[PDB]
Amino acid sequence: LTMVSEVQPVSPASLDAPLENAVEIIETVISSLHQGDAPLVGQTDSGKIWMFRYGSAEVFVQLSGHTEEDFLTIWSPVLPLPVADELALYRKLLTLNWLTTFEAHFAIAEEQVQVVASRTLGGITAGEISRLITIVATLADDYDDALRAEFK
């Protein structure tokens, strides 16, 4: 009497894709990266958004949707303005913006200096999502204190 233990040993895996599943990825990434209160989550007219703490900084992650034309934006305010010597500040931020900040960079918004990285979702991978959130967070944690000590 013939027997077949596994009628279907393997099968085409229905694989979660990084584009359609950027959410679950952002979540497991923040789950391990955060060093603070349970991260918060909300909805903006521009999409889903997460808030967490890394070191001394507050980091924001926003996913406006799951199509290639959509954006993944990560930022963290590092220094409140104005400041006594804005020229010496702005020139430093812009000099640092040369390779040193990698995929992220310094900018000005909402009366504050922000560390930010923004990109389209086309061709995005889990490794890249993990990398961008980490870069913005580590840069933000390293420079918020250094910048205050020097311009306050």
Next chain:
Amino acid sequence: SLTMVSEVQPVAPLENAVEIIETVISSLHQGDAPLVGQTDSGKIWMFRYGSAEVFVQLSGHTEEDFLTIWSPVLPLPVADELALYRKLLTLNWLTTFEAHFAIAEEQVQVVASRTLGGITAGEISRLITIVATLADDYDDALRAEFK
């Protein structure tokens, strides 16, 4: 430091990296043929887009290596540096996309830099276009307002 300078011949996103960049640059460039060369920090490319000269660099072929796309848009010094730097750091907020403004070698640069991990042909074409069009748009605008 430049070397092996030559012109781009119009011919696995990590293996065809060089062929991909050259294909993108060939379709994008205007005017003289795009150039290619060796640098001690990696392989480099040079082409014209509008009024700007755009540069590209591939420092290697591994996942941790870099792709840097940049272009000079305004020579420094300038009269109102405070007003300029403020404007640049303000456009740096979302408006410049994956790219952004910086300062390097006494000149204002438009640049986008990233790691090769997970990179696709599509992203390479987009980053280069983004820097190229941002540079062509602002070098004139910035010269007018500050030079």
